[PDB]
Amino acid sequence: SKVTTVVATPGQGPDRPQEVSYTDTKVIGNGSFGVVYQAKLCDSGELVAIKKVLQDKRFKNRELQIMRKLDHCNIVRLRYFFYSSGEKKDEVYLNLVLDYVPETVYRVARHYSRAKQTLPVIYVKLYMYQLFRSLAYIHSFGICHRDIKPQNLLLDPDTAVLKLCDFGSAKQLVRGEPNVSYICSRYYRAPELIFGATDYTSSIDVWSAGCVLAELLLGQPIFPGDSGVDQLVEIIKVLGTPTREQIREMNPNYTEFKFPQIKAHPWTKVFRPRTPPEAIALCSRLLEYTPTARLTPLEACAHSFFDELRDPNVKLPNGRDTPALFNFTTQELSSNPPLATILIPPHARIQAAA
Amino acid sequence: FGSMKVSRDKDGSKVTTVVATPGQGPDRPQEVSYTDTKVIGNGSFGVVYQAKLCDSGELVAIKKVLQDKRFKNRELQIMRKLDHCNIVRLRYFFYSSGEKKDEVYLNLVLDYVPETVYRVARHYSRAKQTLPVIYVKLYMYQLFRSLAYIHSFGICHRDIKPQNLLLDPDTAVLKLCDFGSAKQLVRGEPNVSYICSRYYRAPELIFGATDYTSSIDVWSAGCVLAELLLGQPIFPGDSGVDQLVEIIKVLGTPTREQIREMNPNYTEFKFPQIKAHPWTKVFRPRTPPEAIALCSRLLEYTPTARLTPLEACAHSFFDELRDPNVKLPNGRDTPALFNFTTQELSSNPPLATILIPPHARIQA
Ligand SMILES: Nc1ncnc2c1ncn2[C@@H]1O[C@H](COP(=O)(O)OP(=O)(O)O)[C@@H](O)[C@H]1O
Ligand SMILES: Nc1ncnc2c1ncn2[C@@H]1O[C@H](COP(=O)(O)OP(=O)(O)O)[C@@H](O)[C@H]1O
Ligand SMILES: [Mg+2]
Ligand SMILES: [Mg+2]
């Protein structure tokens, strides 16, 4: 029962540090940048995850700066942050104290994959809708996650709540400012990224999201490949060869234009026969070559595929009610306010003033 | 646009007869008949089959790829001019009509090789063992020879990885294969940076350079060497940033100048300032120091700073291969290692004074 007490700064609000004690510290993962532990807050008994990262003393942490301003039900909450020293030297570590979430879309999907079972579409709708809400939210601040993948989507299976995590690659994208094309994990990288564009936009997160949806529907990654060339061949097999304008839309630079002219593969033949047409339709509107042609996250949320979620009688397979799905804020709807008419159904958020 | 002729020699045995063009010799079509066709590979481009030559009984591999009636096949054009003991041989090629449509398939008939560095390394990895260093020396040396050869023609493979390195276990012969990404690099001409497999990509490729040279193959070979010594890939990562982190952990943070060397264009300069990781601390204890020295000279940020394939061949890590009494563990003789040609040595002729050991120069 070794207790650790630190003076940590609330993730949000005023920089007014408080003493915080925790115990039952057990490693629960690793990262190229640092370790992630689980601990229990002594005062509340609540479980949290502590992401420890080496911090450059001379510069401020971008991940921390971004986390501090986010407050959405579908994004993992930064509870506190504090600094600790790495005895290995005069090394200083930034410790992010986050809400603890038990699962990830990756592990859950792997379970169904192994059991040779399909993840019920009700969950595909629930998880994807919540991911789009988190993207609509961060994108409204000009922030692009840049690493959307199953492992960065935390899940609480009992409540069916999804929380986007890992803002280690996130960045506010400013029109005209170049950005590195080597972010984002293989399989989920937008074509413009594979083509080396540095003028990409937040729509790269929408392509990534589309790859997650298709993978949840298919039971395996939709555009695998060990090399950029292999990945592009898989994309072309499904979408057909990119037009000259489309290539120009992604990145008007890359030389090699030598690519087998394949006709677009009917999106319907891509998935199993039982697959809902709305799911396929949504897919084709996310996985588009021309970045600007892709649906925005908010538009995705309003898509027909998510209509069941807006049904007043919908319930979770475990009998519980669905989690929060309609508590949209002005900020979240800013990219297209009129969508509120679709996004907040008649029965939702009905509350009188006594 | 050609055709085949299927029949049944005897016992119901299906025999396919085609008219193929010699891979290297003059265009004298020859009739080729084979049986027992079974898939032994598959790529986004086509399928690789194993077939038995009807008369010689010889086994061969047939790489079937969809052919674009638009331009000529670059892989075939390159393979046709190659002739080296450490490069898989193109016996002949022929076209076959894909019964699927007006689609034509190019068929490359290659010498068949039983293993790949990928499979062998995985066998040892599973058993939590490591490949004896003598094999690491033999395989890497042969890989560098094949690279010195194609590079002498200005050709860059662009996809060096364990799966593209065929091996004959008994003879310990290694043959480079898969020239589907290969291209002659002409200074001043831009080239795509999305070639090469993750884990084996040079940093300038990760940074998106389009003015890279053949030295990217040298970086890739360095990753193979390090991997054969470690038992696992040295620079894994699901994203480019993760890969760069692993690289920086070992090589240290790249100086602003080194960055300029790989790609003078990419933005992000925001990367943890880690100190150079003692290469000796990277490998298991008792790893030959020469092996570690070679790795460090192959895996350099600055492209022009990496050893060339011929220089790698002359490295001291391979001194044992030049010993007159060196033999394979199975008591057998090592494969041909010193029959260098003028072409092969063209990059630095004087290196031959090291590459060709005294005993190999004995008249007899
Ligand atoms: N709040 C959390 N609750 C539970 N597990 C977490 C939490 N945050 C992270 N993890 C686990 O740790 C892994 C690494 O965390 P992450 O934030 O993605 O760091 P990295 O930069 O290495 O990707 C995650 O993919 C996840 O499995
Ligand atoms: N000559 C050969 N002998 C035996 N197996 C081969 C031969 N050429 C290729 N293969 C097998 O087929 C796989 C794919 O061949 P490759 O030429 O690399 O095609 P691609 O990478 O374009 O799919 C190889 O990694 C190897 O295992
Ligand atoms: Mg992660
Ligand atoms: Mg290959």
Curated annotation (Swiss-Prot), chain B:
Query: In which residues is ATP bound?
Result: 40-48, 63
Where in the cell?
A: Cytoplasm; Nucleus; Cell membrane
Q: What happens to this protein after translation, modification-wise?
A: Phosphorylated by AKT1 and ILK1. Upon insulin-mediated signaling, the activated PKB/AKT1 protein kinase phosphorylates and deactivates GSK3B, resulting in the dephosphorylation and activation of GYS1. Activated by phosphorylation at Tyr-194. Phosphorylated in a circadian manner in the hippocampus.
Q: Which gene is this protein's source?
A: GSK3B
Q: What is this protein called?
A: Glycogen synthase kinase-3 beta
Protein species of origin: Homo sapiens (Human)
UniProt subunit comment? Monomer. Interacts with ARRB2, DISC1 and ZBED3. Interacts with CABYR, MMP2, MUC1, NIN and PRUNE1. Interacts with AXIN1; the interaction mediates hyperphosphorylation of CTNNB1 leading to its ubiquitination and destruction. Interacts with and phosphorylates SNAI1. Interacts with DNM1L (via a C-terminal domain). Found in a complex composed of MACF1, APC, AXIN1, CTNNB1 and GSK3B. Interacts with SGK3. Interacts with DAB2IP (via C2 domain); the interaction stimulates GSK3B kinase activation. Interacts (via C2 domain) with PPP2CA. Interacts with the CLOCK-BMAL1 heterodimer.
* Upper classification of the organism: Eukaryota, Metazoa, Chordata, Craniata, Vertebrata
- InterPro entries per UniProt: GSK-3 (IPR050591), Kinase-like_dom_sf (IPR011009), Prot_kinase_dom (IPR000719), Protein_kinase_ATP_BS (IPR017441), Ser/Thr_kinase_AS (IPR008271), STKc_GSK3 (IPR039192)
Q: List the disulfide bonds.
A: none
| Major location category of this protein | cytoplasm
